[PDB]
Scaffold this motif. Structure first.
Motif, mmCIF file in Angstrom:
data_model
loop_
_atom_site.group_PDB
_atom_site.id
_atom_site.type_symbol
_atom_site.label_atom_id
_atom_site.label_comp_id
_atom_site.label_asym_id
_atom_site.label_seq_id
_atom_site.Cartn_x
_atom_site.Cartn_y
_atom_site.Cartn_z
ATOM 1 N N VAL A 19 0.853 -1.183 0.000
ATOM 2 C CA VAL A 19 0.000 0.000 0.000
ATOM 3 C C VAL A 19 0.890 1.234 0.000
ATOM 4 N N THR A 20 0.626 2.154 -0.924
ATOM 5 C CA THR A 20 1.434 3.356 -1.090
ATOM 6 C C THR A 20 0.534 4.584 -1.068
ATOM 7 N N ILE A 21 0.909 5.575 -0.261
ATOM 8 C CA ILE A 21 0.173 6.827 -0.125
ATOM 9 C C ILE A 21 1.179 7.969 -0.182
ATOM 10 N N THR A 22 0.808 9.067 -0.840
ATOM 11 C CA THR A 22 1.706 10.201 -1.010
ATOM 12 C C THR A 22 1.085 11.469 -0.441
ATOM 13 N N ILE A 29 9.132 21.800 3.669
ATOM 14 C CA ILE A 29 8.976 21.581 5.099
ATOM 15 C C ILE A 29 10.112 20.737 5.661
ATOM 16 N N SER A 30 11.201 20.587 4.910
ATOM 17 C CA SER A 30 12.348 19.748 5.288
ATOM 18 C C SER A 30 11.816 18.329 5.475
ATOM 19 N N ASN A 31 12.071 17.672 6.605
ATOM 20 C CA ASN A 31 11.572 16.328 6.859
ATOM 21 C C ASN A 31 10.598 16.313 8.032
ATOM 22 N N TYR A 32 9.875 17.410 8.239
ATOM 23 C CA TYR A 32 8.992 17.556 9.399
ATOM 24 C C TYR A 32 7.556 17.129 9.093
ATOM 25 N N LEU A 33 7.380 15.919 8.568
ATOM 26 C CA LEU A 33 6.062 15.382 8.258
ATOM 27 C C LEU A 33 5.842 14.095 9.037
ATOM 28 N N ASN A 34 4.627 13.911 9.541
ATOM 29 C CA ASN A 34 4.283 12.738 10.327
ATOM 30 C C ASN A 34 3.103 12.016 9.695
ATOM 31 N N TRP A 35 3.004 10.722 9.981
ATOM 32 C CA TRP A 35 1.917 9.886 9.493
ATOM 33 C C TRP A 35 1.204 9.231 10.667
ATOM 34 N N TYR A 36 -0.126 9.217 10.607
ATOM 35 C CA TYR A 36 -0.960 8.673 11.667
ATOM 36 C C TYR A 36 -1.894 7.611 11.106
ATOM 37 N N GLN A 37 -2.274 6.674 11.969
ATOM 38 C CA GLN A 37 -3.263 5.647 11.663
ATOM 39 C C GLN A 37 -4.445 5.839 12.599
ATOM 40 N N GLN A 38 -5.634 6.022 12.035
ATOM 41 C CA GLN A 38 -6.847 6.174 12.829
ATOM 42 C C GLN A 38 -7.815 5.058 12.466
ATOM 43 N N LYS A 39 -7.968 4.099 13.370
ATOM 44 C CA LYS A 39 -8.995 3.084 13.242
ATOM 45 C C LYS A 39 -10.347 3.662 13.649
ATOM 46 N N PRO A 40 -11.443 3.099 13.137
ATOM 47 C CA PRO A 40 -12.766 3.664 13.432
ATOM 48 C C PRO A 40 -13.057 3.693 14.925
ATOM 49 N N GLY A 41 -13.589 4.826 15.383
ATOM 50 C CA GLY A 41 -13.884 5.023 16.788
ATOM 51 C C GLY A 41 -12.678 5.214 17.677
ATOM 52 N N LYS A 42 -11.487 5.344 17.100
ATOM 53 C CA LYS A 42 -10.246 5.423 17.852
ATOM 54 C C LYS A 42 -9.580 6.773 17.626
ATOM 55 N N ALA A 51 9.103 11.944 9.037
ATOM 56 C CA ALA A 51 8.967 11.472 7.662
ATOM 57 C C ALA A 51 9.723 10.179 7.379
ATOM 58 N N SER A 52 10.628 9.776 8.271
ATOM 59 C CA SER A 52 11.402 8.563 8.023
ATOM 60 C C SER A 52 11.479 7.613 9.206
ATOM 61 N N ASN A 53 11.246 8.064 10.433
ATOM 62 C CA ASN A 53 11.552 7.284 11.623
ATOM 63 C C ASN A 53 10.323 6.527 12.105
ATOM 64 N N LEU A 54 10.503 5.234 12.362
ATOM 65 C CA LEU A 54 9.434 4.389 12.880
ATOM 66 C C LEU A 54 9.215 4.702 14.356
ATOM 67 N N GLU A 55 7.999 5.120 14.699
ATOM 68 C CA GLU A 55 7.683 5.427 16.087
ATOM 69 C C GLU A 55 7.778 4.169 16.939
ATOM 70 N N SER A 63 6.490 2.235 6.977
ATOM 71 C CA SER A 63 7.676 3.032 6.708
ATOM 72 C C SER A 63 7.263 4.321 6.019
ATOM 73 N N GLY A 64 8.191 5.272 5.998
ATOM 74 C CA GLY A 64 7.972 6.529 5.308
ATOM 75 C C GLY A 64 9.272 7.030 4.722
ATOM 76 N N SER A 65 9.145 7.880 3.708
ATOM 77 C CA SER A 65 10.310 8.465 3.060
ATOM 78 C C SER A 65 9.904 9.779 2.411
ATOM 79 N N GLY A 66 10.904 10.599 2.117
ATOM 80 C CA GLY A 66 10.684 11.872 1.456
ATOM 81 C C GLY A 66 11.312 13.030 2.204
ATOM 82 N N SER A 67 11.634 14.085 1.462
ATOM 83 C CA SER A 67 12.169 15.306 2.041
ATOM 84 C C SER A 67 11.783 16.472 1.145
ATOM 85 N N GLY A 68 11.609 17.640 1.756
ATOM 86 C CA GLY A 68 11.226 18.814 1.000
ATOM 87 C C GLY A 68 9.727 18.952 0.831
ATOM 88 N N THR A 69 9.208 18.531 -0.327
ATOM 89 C CA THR A 69 7.794 18.682 -0.638
ATOM 90 C C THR A 69 7.080 17.389 -1.009
#
Lengths: 203, 226
Positions: A19-22, A29-42, A51-55, A63-69
């Protein structure tokens, strides 16, 4: 100030594939982007930070990747419990979200019917419930026949989110009648398209 | 363990105000900012503002400027979000979150979220639910599988949560989303499928909780003889 463009709005994929999402930022924004998972009701759950580090605690398939835009979020092998809506975010701006769904094989619903309880009848109202259990795909038409007469305007449907284990849906149809009307008729049928489940009031 | 726990859901009349609490524990309350993010039903996430628990400085998005107030009480490690002059479209789940440690001066990596607080902006009053059995019978038996459940009818506002056997029964459970009846009250059903050979042997109890009315109902669903 900053606008995020998340894509796709939604996707459907099988268990195990990638699964790939962009997300595209309006400005560097340099590498200051975060990704979240929201399950229903949660509440949202942080998965990728900076943008790159596994919490901490997050399974390695995320996983995540990218820098800049330009940035990317990836689930290496999709799992049944990964049904959720995923968001990217920088500072004060959240992306529009991506609802990832599972494609699976067809499953016929298990149809059950529940007559109104005697306890509810003492209150002057009757609710008769038809249950469609563990079916795929989501599309289903449910109608109520009372003494072989079509009903309209007195039933409400509710569909659960895709199950975290078998990726099926479940549906409930609730026909609401007054106590007098319920005792005024005999045959109560639930038609699911096409199979029928019905009961007799006195039995 | 680092936990952030918010106050319970409630309904507030239009034009009134709501104040949601956010209690942090397991870490130094002053070392992290407290942000607020809200989510309208079926919508995305919207950042509202942050507060620094150390000195109390705030920063609100211009949409809520002049209408929101964020405070904190360090003696109890609690932040507060007050939203005044409530609109019908203020109906949303309100979250508080803390960010991870960072040195750039703008830490926005929300690593811990509160459970959320559903604020319903409506004039309707709070009403506790009525719980009725969905008894398993022949009409609720297909193959070797039987269906049973509980009907939670005529409550307001949302939400109600349902568990089975105090959480010990989770497999096969389906708690449907509430439907808004024409009467203005909510209603939902929670069901579970079990082997038909366990009817009359295993005990099945549904635990319905409606925090807005401070009402908990535990009902044992018994088999029918038909």
């Amino acid at each position: 100030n900053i606008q995020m463009t998340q894509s796709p709005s939604s996707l459907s994929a099988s268990v195990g594939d990638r699964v790939t999402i962009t997300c595209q930022a309006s400005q560097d924004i340099s590498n200051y982007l975060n990704w979240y998972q929201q399950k229903p009701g949660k509440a949202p759950k942080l998965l990728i930070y900076d943008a790159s580090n596994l919490e901490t605690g997050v399974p390695s398939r995320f996983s995540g990747s990218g820098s800049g835009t330009h940035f990317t979020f990836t689930i290496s092998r999709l799992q049944p419990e990964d049904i959720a809506t995923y968001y990217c975010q920088v500072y004060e701006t959240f992306g529009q979200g991506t609802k990832v769904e599972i494609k699976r094989t067809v499953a016929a619903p298990s149809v059950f019917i529940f007559p109104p309880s005697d306890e509810q009848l003492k209150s002057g109202t009757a609710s008769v419930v038809c249950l469609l259990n563990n079916f795929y795909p989501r599309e289903a038409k449910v109608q109520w026949k009372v003494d072989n007469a079509l009903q309209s305007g007195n039933s409400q449907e509710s569909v659960t989110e895709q199950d975290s284990k078998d990726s099926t849906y479940s549906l409930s149809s609730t026909l609401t009648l007054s106590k007098a009307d319920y005792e005024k008729h005999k045959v109560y049928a639930c038609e699911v398209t096409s199979v029928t489940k019905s009961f007799n009031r006195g039995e | 363990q680092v936990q952030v726990v918010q106050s319970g859901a409630e309904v507030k009349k239009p034009g009134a105000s709501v104040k949601v609490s956010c209690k942090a524990s397991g870490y130094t309350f002053t070392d992290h900012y407290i942000h607020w993010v809200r989510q309208a039903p079926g919508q995305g996430l919207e950042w509202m503002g942050w507060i620094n628990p150390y000195r109390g400085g705030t920063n609100y998005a211009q949409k809520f400027q002049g209408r929101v107030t964020m405070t904190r009480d360090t003696s109890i490690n609690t932040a507060y979000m007050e939203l005044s002059r409530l609109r019908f479209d203020d109906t949303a789940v309100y979250y508080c979150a803390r960010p991870k440690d960072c040195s750039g001066g703008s830490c926005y990596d929300f690593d811990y979220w509160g459970q959320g607080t559903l604020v319903t902006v409506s004039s309707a009053s709070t009403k506790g639910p009525s719980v009725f059995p969905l008894a398993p019978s022949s009409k609720s038996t297909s193959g070797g599988t039987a269906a049973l459940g509980c009907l939670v009818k005529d409550y307001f506002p949302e939400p109600v949560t349902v568990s089975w056997n105090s959480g010990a029964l989770t497999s096969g459970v389906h708690t449907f989303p509430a439907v808004l009846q024409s009467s203005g009250l909510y209603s939902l059903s929670s069901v579970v499928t079990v082997p038909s050979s366990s009817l009359g042997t295993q005990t099945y109890i549904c635990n319905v909780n409606h925090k807005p009315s401070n009402t908990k109902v535990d009902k044992r669903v018994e088999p029918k003889s038909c």
